[PDB]
Amino acid sequence: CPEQDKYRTITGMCNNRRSPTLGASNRAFVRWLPAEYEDGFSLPYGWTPGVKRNGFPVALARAVSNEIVRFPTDQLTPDQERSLMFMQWGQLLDHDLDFTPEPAA
Amino acid sequence: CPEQDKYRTITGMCNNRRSPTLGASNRAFVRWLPAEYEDGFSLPYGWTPGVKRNGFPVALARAVSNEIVRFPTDQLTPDQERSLMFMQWGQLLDHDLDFTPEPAA
Amino acid sequence: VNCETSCVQQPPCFPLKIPPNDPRIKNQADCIPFFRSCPACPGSNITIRNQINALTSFVDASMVYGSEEPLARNLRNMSNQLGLLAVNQRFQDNGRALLPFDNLHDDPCLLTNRSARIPCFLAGDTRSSEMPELTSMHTLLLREHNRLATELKSLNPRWDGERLYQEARKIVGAMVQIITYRDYLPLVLGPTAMRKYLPTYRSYNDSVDPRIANVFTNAFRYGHTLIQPFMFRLDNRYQPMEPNPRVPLSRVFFASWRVVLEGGIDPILRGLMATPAKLNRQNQIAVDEIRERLFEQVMRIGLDLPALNMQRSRDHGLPGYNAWRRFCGLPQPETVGQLGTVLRNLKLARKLMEQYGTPNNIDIWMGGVSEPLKRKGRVGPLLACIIGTQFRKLRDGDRFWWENEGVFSMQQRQALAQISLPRIICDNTGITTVSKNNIFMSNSYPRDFVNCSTLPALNLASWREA
Amino acid sequence: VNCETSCVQQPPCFPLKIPPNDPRIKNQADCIPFFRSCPACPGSNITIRNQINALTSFVDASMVYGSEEPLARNLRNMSNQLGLLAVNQRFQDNGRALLPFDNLHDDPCLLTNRSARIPCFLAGDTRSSEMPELTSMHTLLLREHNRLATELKSLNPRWDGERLYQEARKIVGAMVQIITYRDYLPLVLGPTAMRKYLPTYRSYNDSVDPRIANVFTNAFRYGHTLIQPFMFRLDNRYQPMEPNPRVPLSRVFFASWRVVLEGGIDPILRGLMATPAKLNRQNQIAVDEIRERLFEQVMRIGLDLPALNMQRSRDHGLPGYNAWRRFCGLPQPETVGQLGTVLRNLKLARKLMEQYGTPNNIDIWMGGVSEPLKRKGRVGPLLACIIGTQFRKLRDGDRFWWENEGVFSMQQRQALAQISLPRIICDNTGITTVSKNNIFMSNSYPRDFVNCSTLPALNLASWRE
Amino acid sequence: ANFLEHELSYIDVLLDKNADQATKDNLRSYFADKGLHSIKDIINKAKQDGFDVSKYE
Amino acid sequence: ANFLEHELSYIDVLLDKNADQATKDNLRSYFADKGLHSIKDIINKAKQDGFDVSKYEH
């Protein structure tokens, strides 16, 4: 990494001089806790029929959505103390911070 | 991961039930700090001639050994309060803990 | 197997199965599409799978400028030395720039209104066209760049294109930084968590890891609870704009045509400023426009964003709720009664226990958004811990943090302290009346609105280079 | 490309270059061989390179039993149902068992003597033969397993080979745990750091990561400073054994023959007990038997274990000294004067600054072993932090930790609390007089030596069904 | 990979005889980095990628 | 991978006419896991890997 820098790289590289990939694009996320997969290392919970997580069936995500999340939308509560811009800036901010690629078909 | 068991596996697997590779053999070391490589991700410091580390030439390890470590063997100081078994148990214990494979030939 | 049309579970596909008695999807043999996120080390039996961030973790306006050097070059107007970003060459918005159009192999925007033939936009991040409200914010920042570059050229005529671009970018980055940590995050976390997770800035620390943590990609989707089911558009009296002032969201995803042909970004921004967010409530988590009709105009089935969030966390190998509470130093409820105490809601505790069996298996997004909100914030203690912790690292671990000695002069710092998102809108649109105080709290017209003239501009005098 | 014979720097070779005015290697176009450690993700441009641990992190006596399932089967006596480990079928030690022989591609043990044609030993870890003192410790634990199994069968006649091996293994693991955390680590870290990094055990914690950290593979090489330049062997009166009582280490590496023919393990163990270790001193860090003549008997050139330590650090991408001090809550010296204050030595500080330029680039092992030692410990503050932190994770993060509820009964635990490395020698060797108290502090014959009869045995009464 | 619509305006500047020479070299250099070396290469790449280049002669 | 020296003693138990048949099946099973199904396959593997099996033939 150049020992002299006026502006930032586009890739985020060289921000940290000791460890110059940290925060740069196209690297792995950092893990604050050891990961939790059905097979130890790869398979997501729910993958294999009949495999419990910590001794209990894995709940279908759409079931959890249906039973806990869904509500009658005409009964929605407006926030007296936050504008819609408060949600929108969050999305715009998320898009400065993280994008997790998926294969294409 | 059997929900019941009496003894340890040979591989160390399933020792932690939530994250069953943790402490098992033939898994990557955990990093307590971000790693520090010449190129950011792979090359070791000293790999490329004329590449400095944090602003200074990388010292040949054998130079460091020659200057700092070398001493006349006839000067060696016996430890009054530690036996030779104290060093040996360390090595035996090291071999319970870690072994870092390298290719052969 | 194409994860978009197949319901077979074969790598790389992790489709959501349908429960019996689904209110929307009567066909149990159908599924909701899901591609597992790309592994860092594809194919390995030795490593523990992990996903990739394709962007810079830093708050550096990478969604404007790009996170890859080819793309960053392509976003630039390379026909002169003015240091500007490229602008649409086919359309304007009452004299003002639009984002250029991208050239995609499979362009979802073209599908939203087949007759208008308006493709998706090109920007620093690939998702700028997902909702016109997001597009309007991208459009705004692009315009602000070109304004700053213009003004810097006026002020420093000898400066070349590269110099202009870089100095304007550096300013736009600091503007995102300031809005985010001065105006936004305090209204996310609330004061208690803000003082705990984001104490007054000291200086850069080269030992702080500024990476995004896997869990953050899921926990920051808290904002899905704030989503309103319509896009609101308002005229220059802040009155509904006709014919269509309230468009259902399921008809605005990828709908770039609406920005180009239905009157530019001024009405969308007015809508944002003068319409409330949805409040997260324990019985009103997310709306049907994202739980039942997400992207229904551009795929074969409508998606369920909440459910996607929870499948994703599983895909990414995330620990469940109680592991994250332990991590944050919070009590970990075992029993349904204890979960009721932590949620201040015995009914919801029962509902979560009926699905999950133990609080240990609750998916992080679901547990996070279930927690009662902190005073004067809109997340609860667990999400405030995760989110606060992350944004601390992004500040303390960033060498080009705007307040760090040697990034700006003291004079330049004093100048930047004046910036505000309302002013930026004034400076880049046909809007002359904007929100007051914190744009993020101000929401009722006209009670919370002021004339632009009352607002001081960004003074670039300290950027003069003799 | 062959790292052993070429000095070319191309993957996977990272040879050590030779400075001008080397005391031993005059030729600057020579090198010291080094293979970079295997990457976790071969070939990747995206991941940050990391190395692999081929063993179980846990203190589970994996060096006896293996960390891979085929190897573990191969180490067992499958000709009976007595649950025993395989023993050498060609040679014996005054009637007692020896480790079986391995079948290697280029047995290095065979390149040591050649006349004796004694191959390398086979054990749970691959390094059983590196020095005969290590082999004697492997052989001891092998015999202790077979002792325990025999006695357990006798006590529980109904038990099959699986149950026997498993129950004996459980005990051998707990004995390694107890020696390690009761007798050894307190003499490595000292009282203050022991209380700080290893407070009294509470219970298992499923949320404590038990993985070995990269840095620990380098920092635990502190023990290279304790290595003496000879192997000492003693008779039944703890007197030098003739004709060769003090073998230079350059002639002991991989010398499996010396065990089979030059008198078995009894002499070597006596020597370990009654000979002092080397002391680490800032001007006497490591000796030339490992700094100039490591593996000379089996290689093209002799190696520099200290320099290997520092090359490995770099191969593994370990941060430098000051970064590890910040991690451990220790002050970070910037100037040569401040490094002098931390080392109590402005001379060593100057020497490290001449090589490294900043205290930030000092390699961890070098900075670690430079530090003045803790009271009644043999490492300094930095190394005590790294080592202490790791052994805590192996205790609290171990589901089968010997003290954890459900592993042993209260009666079984009471019995195990009496184990001692001294008794294990009494029980598995021909030796009748052994060290007392802490085997690791006792080091003078006869002052620090007791008779075996004066020592309590392990009562397997609580293991009856 | 793909040609962008706003790059077509750069093809206009190259074919402008009265445009500044330095401006043209800056663009040629832009396109030369993307693997397009002549104006013919550039127009041909825009066609492949779906654009209509009929007003180029 | 390689045949081990101590496994030679297992070949002796198999060829002991007077030895226990359950003992022999335990060993057959041990070797069958390593991919070696007959006594011939076992002796012909040990020879490849450096040992002498002539002490079991003409």
Ligand SMILES: *[C@@H]1O[C@H](CO[C@@H]2O[C@@H](C)[C@@H](O)[C@@H](O)[C@@H]2O)[C@@H](O[C@@H]2O[C@H](CO)[C@@H](O[C@@H]3O[C@H](CO[C@H]4O[C@H](CO)[C@@H](O)[C@H](O)[C@@H]4O)[C@@H](O)[C@H](O[C@H]4O[C@H](CO)[C@@H](O)[C@H](O)[C@@H]4O)[C@H]3NC(C)=O)[C@H](O)[C@H]2NC(C)=O)[C@H](O)[C@H]1NC(C)=O
């Ligand atoms: C620049 O930043 C670094 C990074 O620190 C982080 O910075 C911000 C992001 C903060 O908000 C916060 O998130 C965090 O502090 C600062 O360095 C850190 O400094 C602390 C304080 O010394 C240090 O903590 C100490 O760690 C050691 C080592 O073990 C730690 O790591 C392992 C990793 O797996 C864990 O298992 C372990 O639990 C622990 O986290 C630990 O021994 C210390 O705790 C012992 O000693 C304490 C008293 O000395 C005692 O209270 C405690 O009970 C233990 O006995 C722990 N100390 C404390 C007080 O927490 C970090 O390890 C260190 N990390 C890094 C990356 O360097 C740095 O100070 C800052 N510098 C400046 C100039 O501001």
Ligand SMILES: *[C@@H]1O[C@H](CO[C@@H]2O[C@@H](C)[C@@H](O)[C@@H](O)[C@@H]2O)[C@@H](O[C@@H]2O[C@H](CO)[C@@H](O[C@@H]3O[C@H](CO[C@H]4O[C@H](CO)[C@@H](O)[C@H](O)[C@@H]4O)[C@@H](O)[C@H](O[C@H]4O[C@H](CO)[C@@H](O)[C@H](O)[C@@H]4O)[C@@H]3O)[C@H](O)[C@H]2NC(C)=O)[C@H](O)[C@H]1NC(C)=O
């Ligand atoms: C089971 O063990 C768990 C792990 O224990 C560790 O390992 C053992 C062997 C011991 O060394 C032990 O002391 C270690 O902690 C243990 O869980 C741990 O508990 C601590 C304390 O609650 C948690 O620390 C808290 O973390 C949050 C989040 O920040 C952390 O992560 C970021 C990113 O990695 C880092 O930048 C931070 O430095 C932290 O490491 C902090 O917000 C929090 O501190 C804040 O709040 C406290 C309290 O008000 C203040 O005093 C601080 O100044 C801060 O304002 C803590 O640092 C830790 O995350 C957690 N780890 C795990 C694995 O979950 C658990 O309690 C043990 N259980 C029992 C009952 O034994």
Ligand code: HEM
């Ligand atoms: C108009 C508003 C929003 C959407 C439309 C929208 C949509 C998505 C989708 C489809 C994903 C991917 C889900 C999956 O697992 O397949 C997604 C992820 C993320 N969101 Fe969403 N979101 C909208 C709005 C918001 C708001 C207000 C957020 C927060 C303040 C927010 C956050 C996120 C984040 C951080 C992600 C993850 C990004 C990644 O790729 O890592 N979104 N959103």
Ligand code: HEM
């Ligand atoms: C007779 C005593 C010792 C040796 C002979 C010996 C040799 C080595 C060698 C060659 C290495 C590899 C160096 C490299 O980087 O290539 C090595 C590594 C490790 N040691 Fe050494 N060692 C002897 C003695 C000890 C003692 C007393 C130790 C501990 C107190 C000790 C530790 C270690 C450790 C932990 C390693 C790294 C292991 C790994 O592969 O992960 N050693 N030793």
Ligand SMILES: *[C@@H]1O[C@H](CO)[C@@H](O[C@@H]2O[C@H](CO)[C@@H](O)[C@H](O)[C@H]2NC(C)=O)[C@H](O)[C@H]1NC(C)=O
């Ligand atoms: C690069 O900048 C120039 C100057 O701002 C842009 O040229 C203007 O383009 C608009 C829209 O086509 C025209 O109406 C103006 O007449 C142009 N002005 C001048 C001074 O020529 C140009 O469009 C920009 N290029 C890109 C790709 O954004």
Ligand SMILES: *[C@@H]1O[C@H](CO)[C@@H](O[C@@H]2O[C@H](CO)[C@@H](O)[C@H](O)[C@H]2NC(C)=O)[C@H](O)[C@H]1NC(C)=O
């Ligand atoms: C899709 O796009 C077309 C434009 O191609 C929209 O048609 C315009 O609609 C407005 C408002 O109703 C009319 O005033 C214009 O005259 C229409 N233009 C043309 C040429 O048709 C159409 O409304 C869009 N949206 C929908 C709902 O299909």
Ligand SMILES: *[C@@H]1O[C@H](CO)[C@@H](O[C@@H]2O[C@H](CO)[C@@H](O)[C@H](O)[C@H]2NC(C)=O)[C@H](O)[C@H]1NC(C)=O
């Ligand atoms: C497996 O265990 C048996 C029983 O202890 C061992 O058999 C003894 O072997 C020694 C050495 O060859 C003989 O002197 C004894 O007579 C044998 N005892 C009995 C009762 O058979 C056998 O050697 C062990 N096999 C391995 C590979 O270790």
Ligand SMILES: *[C@@H]1O[C@H](CO)[C@@H](O[C@@H]2O[C@H](CO)[C@@H](O)[C@H](O)[C@H]2NC(C)=O)[C@H](O)[C@H]1NC(C)=O
């Ligand atoms: C190499 O091994 C041989 C084989 O044992 C050692 O030779 C024996 O040494 C003892 C002690 O001098 C003699 O009593 C034996 O008669 C020797 N055996 C035979 C058959 O030669 C030899 O000493 C070893 N080499 C060295 C240098 O120690």
Ligand SMILES: [Ca+2]
């Ligand atoms: Ca960014």
Ligand SMILES: [Ca+2]
């Ligand atoms: Ca082990």
